[PDB]
């Protein structure tokens, strides 16, 4: 059936790239029990809330599939009940700040005294060993660090941040793969080990593509897919040429094609009103004479100007300019549609708003609504992959504490020492 | 002990999605078999290369830890091997186009009939029943069709692709976890799965905060951390203002926080010269007392324009603009070890040149050099997950068809038959 039934996780995360990854393993039918702060519980409860006093669509769209109970750590009663829990418990996930379960009185050794089969998974800035070990980093600190946001943008503008979630949700979908990878090692050796990831290897591994580019333009002295590489065509913004005589790091390339093939991001009707009326349009090396048919350039074919990539190289942005010519009067459907009768790499840029109706996204379960009758319902990102033999059933994020008397229960507490955890503000 | 130590990894992958899935499981232990076509193999090999007739540094990148066998599948007896190395195997992985696999005779329902444990993992552009499920997908049109697209850049320029591969790298290790679910599955139920990753799911994935965005935007009008929403801040094309007025979809905010709290990139010196000295700055509302330090404006500390979240709305670039004059004569680093000592998450853009070459990253296994003799060494991204009793062993990329006669012989087959599959060019 589900490929995490059985698997409890002590679910310590706050934000986004630890919730991400324990919402996810509850999808796939994990028993996440959330441990969260007195009172205010997870930043993200009070966080861009956009009706007062309800648990905002941060916390709820990271928050599915757990349950939550409120804990005092820094109280000896405790650390006592996470004692108990950690032996209950397959996973513990967290992501405080470097060494801030350590300082509690948890260690990965005493943790391994308490459970040897429990799996300690955790994510933080930077690697542990690294200079900037202890520094505490977000999202676009990470996106920084890992190299993004030096390759993203345009040359002739500041190095930019992506809106995909590239430091938080994406360290979270990684440290997935390192407590599976685990729990695989645990069938093996009936022991748990510790695994960690860090935000700036996440966004590295991602990026790829780009330390590939850093090596050949070590080696070259050249990118001839990057515009920078079609003489007189991008400039900084003091106007002086931007050539790869002069460039030693890779750089931005604003919409190249990066480890696609050659693309570029092209101007559909109504472009000057809807900020979103664009298509990404790809001139792959084997579709040339088909692109050729698509504009009308019948003697663009046998060009070897044209018909070659490297022929391309010093002229790539004029036929791009030109193909977008034929893209005034049609919008992102309409191009779309008419690109893929030629079988050309095509798409529209989707608005967020046309993703959160897109009737297949709903179909295939991608864009989900939650049932949520406390809060009213609100859409959700369900599971990204997609199984034979397993639907994911996504349930609504717990109210704060929601869980304590419940959870308390089950480790075999009386009712009397449940309600002096409560006098005691344990819980 | 690796965690993927005795999995059998059949890889038909090329490009970028399906090759980065199988190079990671192959770094945790895998046995990975790469599938090649006769004569130029994966298209990588020939993409970009750094000196004629060798590998490039797209190929040697993403398939470091894999065999490489060429096999024309289009042939009865390259069909009759597949089926022999799939009886074998625990996962096969494709990335080819929609229906391919499928038109070669290798449905998913053949594939069970002639192994019921093995796990089939497949990335394509689109979801299985999707409008656009049969459309060919490269890196940049799945950024544009999950939304990453529309939400990156800024509001006076275009939709924006990031550097980091949000389609291709990002599929691939979501398909991993995918695969890895898929085994602990098969440890309950003795069977094989189908797995699959659209490229469009595993960026709307990493844009999940933007959907919380989109409807926070549906439901109350306005998103207050955006700078759209400061009075006359932000314009458009045409000097006029901007505001959330006529914005239904969710905009593109620049180099705002996201998912982080509240943020911006800020200039250092030598910012003219070089196109990477920034550091991005968060000003979290955890933190606004070690902020004031810092700044050397105590002011701040009580007045309730300055010291709440939703004070601090209408003018929260001025304080940006503010913050950044103070870095005007220290470079990134000099910035980042400052900001560090009141613990406000804040770091430099890093240069791919100075991640290429940096001590720490080599130091904890993150960036790696690659011991290769046929091609001379060159770097890659190592695991970006760190386990407490396990090491990953990088080495080089396979030449083509390299390990056709060793896979062969793995099979069962005598020599003579080897070389009749050599002369009747199936292999
Ligand atoms: C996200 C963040 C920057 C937030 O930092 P922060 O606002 O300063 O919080 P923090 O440093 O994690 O936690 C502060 C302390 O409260 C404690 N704490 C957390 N939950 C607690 C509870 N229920 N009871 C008692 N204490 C608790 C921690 O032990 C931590 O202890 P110290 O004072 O000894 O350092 C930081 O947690 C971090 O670097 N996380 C690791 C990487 C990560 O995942 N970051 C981002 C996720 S999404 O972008
Ligand atoms: C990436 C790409 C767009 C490339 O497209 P393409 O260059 O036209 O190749 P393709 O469509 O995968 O394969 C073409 C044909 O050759 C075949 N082929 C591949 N290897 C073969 C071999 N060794 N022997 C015989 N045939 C082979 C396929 O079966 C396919 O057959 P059809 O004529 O029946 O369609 C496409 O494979 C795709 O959409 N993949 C899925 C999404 C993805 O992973 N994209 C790229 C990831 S990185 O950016």
Not at 109 to 128: D, M, T
Not at 267 to 276: F, N, R, S
Not at 394 to 410: C, F, M, Q, S, Y
Request: a negative charge; hydrophobic letters at 40%.
């Amino acid at each position: 059936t589900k490929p995490l039934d059985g698997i409890n996780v002590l679910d310590f995360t706050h934000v986004q790239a630890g919730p991400a990854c324990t919402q996810m393993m509850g999808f796939l039918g994990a028993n996440v029990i959330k441990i969260e702060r007195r009172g205010s519980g997870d930043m993200t409860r009070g966080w861009l809330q956009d009706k007062p006093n309800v648990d905002s669509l941060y916390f709820t769209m990271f928050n599915c599939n757990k349950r939550s109970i409120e804990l005092d750590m820094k109280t000896p009663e405790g650390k006592e009940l996470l004692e108990q829990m950690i032996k209950k418990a397959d996973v513990m996930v967290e992501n405080f700040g470097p060494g801030a379960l350590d300082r509690m009185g948890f260690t990965w050794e005493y943790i391994q005294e308490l459970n040897p089969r429990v799996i300690l998974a955790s994510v933080k800035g930077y690697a542990e060993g690294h200079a900037n070990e202890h520094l505490k980093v977000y999202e676009n600190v990470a996106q920084c660090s890992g190299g993004a946001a030096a390759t993203t943008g345009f040359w002739d503008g500041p190095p930019t941040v992506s809106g995909a979630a590239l430091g938080a949700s994406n360290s979270g979908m990684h440290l997935m793969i390192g407590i599976l990878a685990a729990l695989e090692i645990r069938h093996k050796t009936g022991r748990g080990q510790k695994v960690a990831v860090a935000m700036q290897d996440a966004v590295l591994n991602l990026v790829r593509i780009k330390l590939r580019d850093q090596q050949r333009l070590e080696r070259t002295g050249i990118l001839a897919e990057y515009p920078q590489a079609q003489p007189n065509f991008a400039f900084d913004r003091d106007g002086n040429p931007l050539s790869f005589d002069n460039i030693t790091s890779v750089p931005r390339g604003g919409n190249a094609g990066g480890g696609g093939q050659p693309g570029w991001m092209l101007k559909c009707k109504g472009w000057e009103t809807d900020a979103d009326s664009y298509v990404y349009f790809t001139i792959a090396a084997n579709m040339w004479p088909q692109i050729c048919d698509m504009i009308d350039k019948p003697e663009w074919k046998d060009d070897p100007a044209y018909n070659t990539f490297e022929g391309r190289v010093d002229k790539l942005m004029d036929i791009f300019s030109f193909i977008e010519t034929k893209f005034a009067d049609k919008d992102k459907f309409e191009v779309t549609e008419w690109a893929a009768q030629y079988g050309i790499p095509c798409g529209p840029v989707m608005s967020m708003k046309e993703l959160a109706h897109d009737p297949s996204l709903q179909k295939v379960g991608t864009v989900v609504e939650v049932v949520d009758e406390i809060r009213g319902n609100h859409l959700t990102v369900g599971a990204p992959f997609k199984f034979s033999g397993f639907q994911p059933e996504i349930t609504r994020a717990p109210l704060l504490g929601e869980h304590t008397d419940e959870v308390l229960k089950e480790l075999g507490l009386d009712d009397a020492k449940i309600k002096e955890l409560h006098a005691k503000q344990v819980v």
